[PDB]
Design a protein around this motif. Structure first.
Motif, PDB file in Angstrom:
ATOM      1  N   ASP A 126      40.344  45.046  46.407  1.00 21.72           N
ATOM      2  CA  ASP A 126      39.016  44.978  45.602  1.00 21.72           C
ATOM      3  C   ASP A 126      39.125  44.999  44.065  1.00 21.72           C
ATOM      4  N   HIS A 127      38.735  44.039  43.594  1.00 17.15           N
ATOM      5  CA  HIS A 127      38.698  44.129  41.953  1.00 17.15           C
ATOM      6  C   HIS A 127      37.320  43.621  41.436  1.00 17.15           C
ATOM      7  N   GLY A 128      36.293  44.293  41.810  1.00 20.16           N
ATOM      8  CA  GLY A 128      34.890  44.110  41.038  1.00 20.16           C
ATOM      9  C   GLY A 128      34.045  43.027  41.327  1.00 20.16           C
ATOM     10  N   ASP A 129      34.287  41.875  41.910  1.00 16.30           N
ATOM     11  CA  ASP A 129      33.700  40.545  42.343  1.00 16.30           C
ATOM     12  C   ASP A 129      33.273  40.350  43.580  1.00 16.30           C
ATOM     13  N   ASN A 130      33.427  41.310  44.494  1.00 14.77           N
ATOM     14  CA  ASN A 130      32.929  41.439  45.638  1.00 14.77           C
ATOM     15  C   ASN A 130      33.836  40.252  46.876  1.00 14.77           C
ATOM     16  N   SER A 131      34.782  39.612  46.232  1.00 15.34           N
ATOM     17  CA  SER A 131      36.025  38.981  46.918  1.00 15.34           C
ATOM     18  C   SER A 131      37.097  39.659  46.853  1.00 15.34           C
ATOM     19  N   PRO A 132      37.425  40.403  47.519  1.00  9.49           N
ATOM     20  CA  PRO A 132      38.798  40.992  47.502  1.00  9.49           C
ATOM     21  C   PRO A 132      39.894  40.436  48.021  1.00  9.49           C
ATOM     22  N   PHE A 133      41.216  40.612  47.592  1.00  8.28           N
ATOM     23  CA  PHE A 133      42.309  39.658  47.930  1.00  8.28           C
ATOM     24  C   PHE A 133      42.799  40.720  49.192  1.00  8.28           C
ATOM     25  N   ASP A 134      43.974  39.870  49.926  1.00  5.99           N
ATOM     26  CA  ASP A 134      44.045  40.670  51.435  1.00  5.99           C
ATOM     27  C   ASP A 134      45.671  41.096  51.503  1.00  5.99           C
ATOM     28  N   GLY A 135      46.453  41.279  50.370  1.00  4.43           N
ATOM     29  CA  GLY A 135      47.857  41.885  50.580  1.00  4.43           C
ATOM     30  C   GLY A 135      48.923  40.686  50.486  1.00  4.43           C
ATOM     31  N   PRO A 136      49.930  40.960  51.052  1.00  2.00           N
ATOM     32  CA  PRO A 136      51.075  39.625  50.877  1.00  2.00           C
ATOM     33  C   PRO A 136      50.546  38.619  51.691  1.00  2.00           C
ATOM     34  N   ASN A 137      50.854  37.297  51.238  1.00  2.00           N
ATOM     35  CA  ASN A 137      50.565  35.961  51.752  1.00  2.00           C
ATOM     36  C   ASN A 137      49.061  35.881  52.246  1.00  2.00           C
ATOM     37  N   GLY A 138      48.589  34.722  53.117  1.00  2.00           N
ATOM     38  CA  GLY A 138      47.064  34.729  53.123  1.00  2.00           C
ATOM     39  C   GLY A 138      46.676  34.006  51.794  1.00  2.00           C
ATOM     40  N   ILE A 139      45.304  34.725  51.119  1.00  2.00           N
ATOM     41  CA  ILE A 139      44.792  34.280  50.258  1.00  2.00           C
ATOM     42  C   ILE A 139      45.632  34.387  48.986  1.00  2.00           C
ATOM     43  N   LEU A 140      45.974  33.427  48.082  1.00  2.00           N
ATOM     44  CA  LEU A 140      46.897  33.623  47.002  1.00  2.00           C
ATOM     45  C   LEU A 140      46.064  33.566  45.569  1.00  2.00           C
ATOM     46  N   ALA A 141      44.922  33.223  45.608  1.00  2.00           N
ATOM     47  CA  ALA A 141      44.190  33.351  44.537  1.00  2.00           C
ATOM     48  C   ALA A 141      42.682  32.798  44.715  1.00  2.00           C
ATOM     49  N   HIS A 142      41.931  32.774  43.818  1.00  2.00           N
ATOM     50  CA  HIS A 142      40.479  32.157  43.777  1.00  2.00           C
ATOM     51  C   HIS A 142      39.847  32.136  42.207  1.00  2.00           C
ATOM     52  N   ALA A 143      39.029  31.169  42.158  1.00  2.00           N
ATOM     53  CA  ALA A 143      38.394  31.037  40.941  1.00  2.00           C
ATOM     54  C   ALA A 143      36.839  30.351  41.088  1.00  2.00           C
ATOM     55  N   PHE A 144      36.159  30.644  39.941  1.00  2.00           N
ATOM     56  CA  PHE A 144      34.735  30.668  39.943  1.00  2.00           C
ATOM     57  C   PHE A 144      34.387  29.188  39.257  1.00  2.00           C
ATOM     58  N   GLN A 145      33.110  28.595  39.566  1.00  2.00           N
ATOM     59  CA  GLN A 145      32.690  27.420  39.171  1.00  2.00           C
ATOM     60  C   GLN A 145      32.316  27.495  37.938  1.00  2.00           C
ATOM     61  N   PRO A 146      32.086  26.224  36.983  1.00  2.00           N
ATOM     62  CA  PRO A 146      31.793  26.452  35.380  1.00  2.00           C
ATOM     63  C   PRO A 146      30.334  27.032  35.423  1.00  2.00           C
ATOM     64  N   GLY A 147      30.385  28.038  34.181  1.00  2.00           N
ATOM     65  CA  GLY A 147      29.022  28.894  34.070  1.00  2.00           C
ATOM     66  C   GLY A 147      29.293  29.892  32.992  1.00  2.00           C
ATOM     67  N   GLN A 148      28.392  30.830  32.624  1.00  2.00           N
ATOM     68  CA  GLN A 148      28.769  31.877  31.723  1.00  2.00           C
ATOM     69  C   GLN A 148      29.234  32.991  32.767  1.00  2.00           C
ATOM     70  N   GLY A 149      29.557  34.102  31.890  1.00  2.00           N
ATOM     71  CA  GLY A 149      29.943  35.396  32.435  1.00  2.00           C
ATOM     72  C   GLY A 149      31.138  34.993  33.466  1.00  2.00           C
ATOM     73  N   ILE A 150      31.468  35.399  34.587  1.00  2.00           N
ATOM     74  CA  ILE A 150      32.430  35.110  35.652  1.00  2.00           C
ATOM     75  C   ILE A 150      32.731  33.804  36.048  1.00  2.00           C
ATOM     76  N   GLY A 151      31.868  32.974  35.559  1.00  2.78           N
ATOM     77  CA  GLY A 151      31.976  31.642  36.041  1.00  2.78           C
ATOM     78  C   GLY A 151      33.108  30.856  35.091  1.00  2.78           C
ATOM     79  N   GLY A 152      33.980  30.169  35.932  1.00  3.64           N
ATOM     80  CA  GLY A 152      35.357  29.633  35.538  1.00  3.64           C
ATOM     81  C   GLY A 152      36.402  30.538  35.358  1.00  3.64           C
ATOM     82  N   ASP A 153      36.333  31.929  35.600  1.00  4.35           N
ATOM     83  CA  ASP A 153      37.230  32.780  35.397  1.00  4.35           C
ATOM     84  C   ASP A 153      37.919  32.507  36.967  1.00  4.35           C
ATOM     85  N   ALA A 154      39.491  32.995  36.775  1.00  4.34           N
ATOM     86  CA  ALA A 154      40.404  32.841  37.726  1.00  4.34           C
ATOM     87  C   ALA A 154      41.400  33.944  37.899  1.00  4.34           C
ATOM     88  N   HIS A 155      41.453  34.310  39.044  1.00  2.00           N
ATOM     89  CA  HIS A 155      42.111  35.702  39.739  1.00  2.00           C
ATOM     90  C   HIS A 155      43.391  35.191  40.660  1.00  2.00           C
TER      91      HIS A 155
END
Ligand SMILES: NC(=O)C[C@@H]1CCCc2sc3nc(C(=O)NCc4ccc5c(c4)NC(=O)CO5)[nH]c(=O)c3c21
Ligand SMILES: [Ca+2]
Ligand SMILES: [Ca+2]
Ligand SMILES: [Zn+2]
Ligand SMILES: [Zn+2]
Length: 163
Positions: free
Chosen positions: A67-96
């Motif tokens: 969990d890291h503040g954007d309601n889309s938690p990662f899942d530990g080793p392997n699986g989901i590697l990262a995610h990003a947000f579509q263009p926009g202000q605020g968190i838009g465009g950001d990549a984790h």
């Protein structure tokens, strides 16, 4: 091919900021991986990416765990590697990126440059592609090669949005 909804950036010069790092690579290797990943898209479009180390960048990059503040938690080793947000202000465009993953600059799982390149496509407004040989294909699969340029399908995707 292009992120649904059609939301895109309206400027061609965008800023980005690496907020933190990963102990598995030097800070310089991280910064280089990001710079090269942005370059793949820049050479096939009018987009120009500039780095800042303070202030609000258009694209925030960061390594987080579970969990890291954007309601889309990662899942530990392997699986989901990262995610990003579509263009926009605020968190838009950001990549984790999932901080629990092994990050490399080699063919070993998982190459930061490759994952970042894929995530930035989402940050720019591209959706997943059905082409198994495309950068934007849904599943990660490192391909040993000498030609480090965007696959033609991804070129079509970005040009379709930004010309
Ligand atoms: N060999 C390299 O340095 C990368 C190689 C040459 C440079 C241009 C491209 S685009 C590409 N695309 C893939 C590939 O597996 N694309 C689908 C994909 C990649 C990364 C991903 C995902 C899918 N999905 C995720 O959730 C996470 O990040 N593999 C490559 O080796 C590759 C290369
Ligand atoms: Ca942003
Ligand atoms: Ca994970
Ligand atoms: Zn996130
Ligand atoms: Zn994706």
């Amino acid at each position: 091919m292009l992120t649904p909804g059609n939301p895109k950036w309206e400027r061609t010069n965008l800023t980005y900021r690496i907020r933190n790092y990963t102990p598995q690579l030097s800070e310089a290797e991280v910064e280089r991986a990001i710079k090269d990943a942005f370059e793949l898209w820049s050479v096939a479009s009018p987009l120009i990416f500039t780095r800042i180390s303070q202030g609000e960048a258009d694209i925030n990059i960061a390594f987080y765990q579970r969990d890291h503040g954007d309601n889309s938690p990662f899942d530990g080793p392997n699986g989901i590697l990262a995610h990003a947000f579509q263009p926009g202000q605020g968190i838009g465009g950001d990549a984790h990126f999932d901080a629990e993953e092994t990050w490399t600059n080699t063919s070993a799982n998982y190459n930061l440059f490759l994952v970042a390149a894929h995530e930035f496509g989402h940050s720019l407004g591209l959706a997943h592609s059905s082409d198994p040989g495309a950068l934007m294909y849904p599943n990660y699969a490192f391909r040993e090669t000498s030609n480090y340029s965007l696959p033609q399908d991804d070129i079509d995707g970005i040009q379709a949005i930004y010309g």
